[PDB]
Symmetry: D3
C-alpha cells in the first residue's frame, strides 16, 4: 500500500496543478473571445 | 458577431464543467489517498 | 516493474471512476439545458 | 431559445467525445497493465 | 523518491499517448462535421 | 446547415484548447520527473 499511496499522492499533487492550468487556459480563451466579440460589435 | 459569441458560449460552458470536474477528481484522489494511508 | 504495475493499476482504478463522474456531470448539464430550452419554448 | 439550444449542442458534442475518450484511455491503461504484469 | 519517479515516468508515458488519442479523436469528429456541413450545403 | 456549423465550431475550439493543454501537462510531468530524478 505504500508504493500505492506514494503514487496516488504524487498524482493528486500533479492533478491539482493540471486543474489550475486548464482553468486558466480556458479563462484566457474566454476573455479573448469576449474582447473580440466587443471589438466587432 | 454571432461567430465570436457562439464560440465564447461553448468555452464558457466547458470552463464551468471543467471547474466542477476538477473538484470531483481532487475529492476522489484525497479520498483514495486517505483510504490507502488508513488501510481502509 | 512491480512498482510500475501497482502505480498503473491504481491509476486505471481512479480513471475508471473519473470517467464515470465526468460523463454523469456532462449528462446532468445536458438534461438541465434541454429542460431550460423547453421551458422557454 | 437559441441560447439554451447552442449550449446544449456544445455539451452533447463534448459528452459524446468524452464517452469515446474514456474508452480509449481505459483500453490503453489495461493494455499497459497487462504488458507490465507479463514483462512484454 | 524512486517509487515516485517511476510512477511519474509511467504516467507521463501514458499521458503522452492519451494526448495523441484525444487530439486524433477530436480531429476526426471535426473532419466529419465539416464534411456533413458541406454535404448539406 | 447552421446545425453542423455550430457543432464544428465547438469541436474546433475544444480541439485547439486540448492541444495546448496537452503541451502544458507534458511540460509539468517532465519538470516534476526531472526534479525527482535530481532531488530538487
Ligand atoms: Cl447557467
Ligand atoms: Cl451525430
Ligand atoms: Cl482564433
Amino acid at each position: 500500500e505504500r508504493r500505492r499511496s506514494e503514487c496516488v499522492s504524487e498524482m493528486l499533487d500533479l492533478e491539482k496543478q493540471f486543474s489550475e492550468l486548464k482553468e486558466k487556459l480556458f479563462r484566457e480563451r474566454l476573455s479573448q473571445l469576449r474582447l473580440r466579440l466587443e471589438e466587432v460589435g
